[PDB]
Amino acid sequence: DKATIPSESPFAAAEVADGAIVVDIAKMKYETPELHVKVGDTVTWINREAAPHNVHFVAGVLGEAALKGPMMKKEQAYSLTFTEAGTYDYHCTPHPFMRGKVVVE
Numbered sequence: 001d002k003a004t005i006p007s008e009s010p011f012a013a014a015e016v017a018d019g020a021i022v023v024d025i026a027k028m029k030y031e032t033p034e035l036h037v038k039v040g041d042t043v044t045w046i047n048r049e050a051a052p053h054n055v056h057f058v059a060g061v062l063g064e065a066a067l068k069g070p071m072m073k074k075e076q077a078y079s080l081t082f083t084e085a086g087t088y089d090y091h092c093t094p095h096p097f098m099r100g101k102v103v104v105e
């Protein structure tokens with residue numbers, strides 16, 4: 001695999017780690033839709049909206065299986081720690097017009 005999951009389920013926005021890089025989910029978009037990070041960085045998405053949102057990487061992107069992130073309620077967060085260089089596309093399962101990518105250098 002190319003990422004580890006610190007918390008399998010969402011956690012409170014106010015619990016976000018120091019050093020995490022944050023991507024806000026607001027205005028029905030990933031507000032940083034192309035994020036560039038380094039190997040070993042933790043990316044945290046935060047849902048600012050009432051509707052649930054997640055991040056979803058299809059099979060073969062972060063590893064063999066799809067990574068279907070948990071549904072984040074309003075003011076919840078979810079993190080992934082990227083361990084290998086690559087370009088990792090994702091989308092929102094309930095709202096698949098929402099697209100993003102993490103580029104790990």
Ligand SMILES: [Cu+]
Pocket residue numbers: 052053054092093094095098
């Ligand atoms: Cu979404």
